[PDB]
């Protein structure tokens, strides 16, 4: 006979049985595959405009698709930004200034600033320029104040001159969806924003953040650690009483 038992490492790696509904769900469960099935466009070459022309035009059109969410050929976007493209080919400016000129353009303002309230403006421009939704209440306050007091272009430049843009995208890469893991609620809000087609909805995804200043109940004064604290302060008070004269 020479019975040959099934090796243990076979069963150590077996999966539960799964029909088609569970197989489909198991394939598509975690973070969306768009996170890795994508290209990131950066001006890796400092070479002249004469060579690598096609790569550089691909970068330009990727920047258009990132700032305006799609191709804007009907709006003759190429001739509007012709001088800008010429400067970026001649390496007079970097990718970040190209993005700054597209995001501060009149076309961008008509597409994403004029149609929406300032909160939606903050979240849309943060999606287009930082790759994420509005992060917390402090960021909403900061950009709301800029929009209220200085308007649209200082708002765009405040986003683009922030340290976060410099750390993530620097001066050479076109922005992209970041799939941010931190902080809390950034990931789902960002996914909601980036799973939306252009003009899919006019609703504000993140109107504001509900304050955590006051909860209802759970004073935490009954906590046994705090109870021990009130126990020990009593002993301290008793000692202070004892250092008084006995009479």
Decide which of ligand CYC, another protein, none touches 84; Cβ closer than 5 to 8 Å per partner kind.
none
Contact 171/123 with Cβ under 8 angstroms?
no
Residue among 1, 5, 21, 54 that touches another protein (CB under 8 A): 54
SS3 content of the chain, % helix, strand, coil (to 5): 50, 0, 45
CA distances in angstroms from 190 to 14, 41, 134, 186, 213, listed in the order given: 36, 20, 8, 6, 25
195 is an interface residue for ligand CYC by CB under 6 A: no
Nearest to 101 by CA among 131, 76, 68, 52: 68
Decide which of ligand CYC, another protein, none touches 26; Cβ closer than 5 to 8 Å per partner kind.
another protein
Number of chain residues interacting with another protein (CB under 8 A) = 104
141 is an interface residue for ligand CYC by CB under 6 A: yes
Segment 144 to 203, residues that bind another protein, using CB under 8 A? 144-145, 148, 157, 161, 163, 166, 170-172, 181, 183-185, 187-189, 191, 195-197, 199-203
Nearer to ligand CYC, 188 or 231 (CB): 188
Residue among 58, 76, 106, 150 that touches another protein (CB under 8 A): 58
User: Before 183, cis peptide (omega within 30)?
Assistant: yes
7 is an interface residue for ligand CYC by CB under 6 A: no
Give the pair of three-digit tokens for residue 34. 């768009």
Compute the least distance from the CB of residue 131 to another protein, in Å: 15
Tell me which stretch binds another protein (CB under 8 A): 13-21, 124-132, 238-246.
Answer: 13-21
H-assigned helices in 12-117: 20-27, 53-67, 77-80, 82-89, 95-103, 106-108
Tell me which stretch binds another protein (CB under 8 A): 51-59, 124-132, 239-247.
Answer: 51-59
Segment 216 to 235, residues that bind another protein, using CB under 8 A? 218, 220-221, 223-226, 228-230, 232-233
């Amino acid at each position: 006979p020479s019975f040959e038992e099934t090796p243990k490492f076979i069963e150590k790696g077996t999966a539960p049985d799964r029909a088609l509904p569970q197989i489909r769900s198991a394939i598509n469960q975690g973070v969306s595959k768009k996170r890795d099935q994508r290209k990131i466009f950066s001006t890796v070459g400092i070479q002249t405009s004469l060579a690598s022309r096609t790569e550089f035009d691909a970068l330009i059109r990727a920047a258009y698709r990132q700032v305006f969410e799609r191709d804007m050929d009907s709006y003759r976007i190429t001739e509007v930004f012709s001088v800008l493209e010429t400067k970026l080919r001649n390496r007079e400016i970097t990718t970040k200034e190209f993005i700054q000129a597209l995001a501060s353009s009149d076309l961008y303002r008509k597409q994403f600033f004029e149609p929406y309230p300032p909160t939606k403006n903050v979240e849309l421009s943060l999606k287009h320029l930082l790759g994420r939704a509005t992060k917390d209440q402090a960021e909403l306050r900061k950009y709301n104040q800029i929009i209220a007091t200085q308007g649209f272009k200082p708002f765009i430049n405040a986003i683009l001159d922030s340290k976060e843009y410099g750390e993530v995208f620097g001066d050479g890469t076109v922005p992209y969806n970041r799939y941010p893991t931190l902080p809390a609620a950034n990931f789902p809000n960002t996914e909601i924003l980036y799973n939306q087609l252009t003009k899919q909805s006019a609703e504000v995804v993140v109107p504001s953040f509900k304050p955590v200043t006051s909860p209802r109940g759970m004073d935490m004064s009954q906590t046994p650690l705090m109870l021990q604290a009130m126990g020990d302060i009593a002993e301290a008070e008793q000692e202070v009483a004892l250092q008084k004269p006995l009479f």
